[PDB]
Amino acid sequence: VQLVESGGGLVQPGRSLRLSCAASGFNFDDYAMHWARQVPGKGLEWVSGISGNSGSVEYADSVKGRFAMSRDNAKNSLYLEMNSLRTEDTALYYCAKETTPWGIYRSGGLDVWGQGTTVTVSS
Amino acid sequence: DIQMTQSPSSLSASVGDRVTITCRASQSIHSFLSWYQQKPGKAPKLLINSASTLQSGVPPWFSGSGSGTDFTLTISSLQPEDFATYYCQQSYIAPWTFGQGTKVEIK
Amino acid sequence: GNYNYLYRLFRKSNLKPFERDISTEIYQAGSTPCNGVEGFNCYFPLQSYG
């Protein structure tokens, strides 16, 4: 179960920048994909999440309508499209799986952590 | 969940005055709090994060403090860009609620 | 910021007079069990003044 992130870089605010992390060593199931961001020197903040059988898409309180996610299980890679970029979004990005797609009590997922690629936004 | 309120619901000041915005919480919030600035018809922005840290690109005359329950934000001098509405939200636990909103107009 | 100013933020109960707390165990987490991690709803009780 290894998660390798990619796509981070330096870009001006307001521009698009799509990040991806490929799922390796993970048996195929309906695991709820989640995303967490970390401002350096600060606490942990969750971003969004998509559960199984498609749909079931939710975001955080401040990223509604500006983030787009789609899941393709054939390539085992998950991507997020970033729109309306601000100077606040400079953080370290971790994508998590929570590895508990159980039919009964699907909540309470142990969110794993990958290597993580941070993003830098300069005005 | 956390039921939060902010005071006052509206404000009126000229350029250069000293005003303050205060919003408390019903549960122990300590220091993890953000103060958003949003304009009518535009996207929001964050000015002060964790109640003590100045963000990159944010001018330094926006200064804030507060711990525990009572929180406050202080403005040294007002600007033509400053006249907009203001929100303060908590960032601790299971999903949060926004504020009812204050407004600063030209008197 | 040579931060040798570590203190305690959270405890299960109030500290009685003349008692020292030394353990670095993770704070309360009443809803979900932390199970020895610093993830969501999981903080170490040691922060510095800075």
Nearest CA in chain C to A113: C39
Distance CA B32, CA C49 (A): 15
Report how this structure was experimentally obtained: cryo-EM
Is the torsion defined by CA of A10, A14, A15, A16 positive or negative? Answer: positive
Whole domain around residue A72: which residue ranges? Answer: 2-121
Contact between B97 and B41 under an 8 Å Cβ cutoff? The reply is no
User: Do residue B30 and residue C31 have CB atoms under 8 angstroms apart?
Assistant: no
Resolution in Å, one decimal, please.
3.8
Q: Look-up: residue for tokens 């330094």?
A: B60
Q: Look-up: residue for tokens 């909540």?
A: A107
Counting the structural domains of chain A, the total is: 1
CATH number at residue A55: 2.60.40.10
Nearest CA in chain B to C30: B93
Of A28, A26, A39, which is closest to residue A118 (Cα–Cα)? A39
Distance CA C14, CA C10 (A): 10
User: Do residue B93 and residue C41 have CB atoms under 8 angstroms apart?
Assistant: yes
From the number of C-beta atoms within 10 Å of its C-beta (0-12, 13-18, 19+), residue B51 rates as buried
Beta-sheet pairing, B11-12 with B102-105: parallel
Residues on A contacting C at a C-beta cutoff of 8 Å? 36, 43-44, 46, 108, 111, 113
Q: Which domains does chain B have, with CATH numbers?
A: 4-106 (2.60.40.10)
Ramachandran assignment for B68, one of left (phi > 0), alpha (psi -120 to 50 degrees), beta (any other): left
How many inter-chain contacts (A to C, CB under 8 Å) are there? 9
Who contacts B34 (Cβ-Cβ below 8 Å, separation ≥6)? B46, B48, B49, B50, B88, B89, B91
Q: Which two tokens stand for residue A18?
A: 């799509």
φ and ψ at B80, to 5 degrees? Answer: -60, -30
Residues on B contacting A at a C-beta cutoff of 8 Å? 32, 36, 43-46, 49-50, 55-57, 89, 91, 95-96, 98
Nearest CB to C32; choose among A43, A108, A113: A108
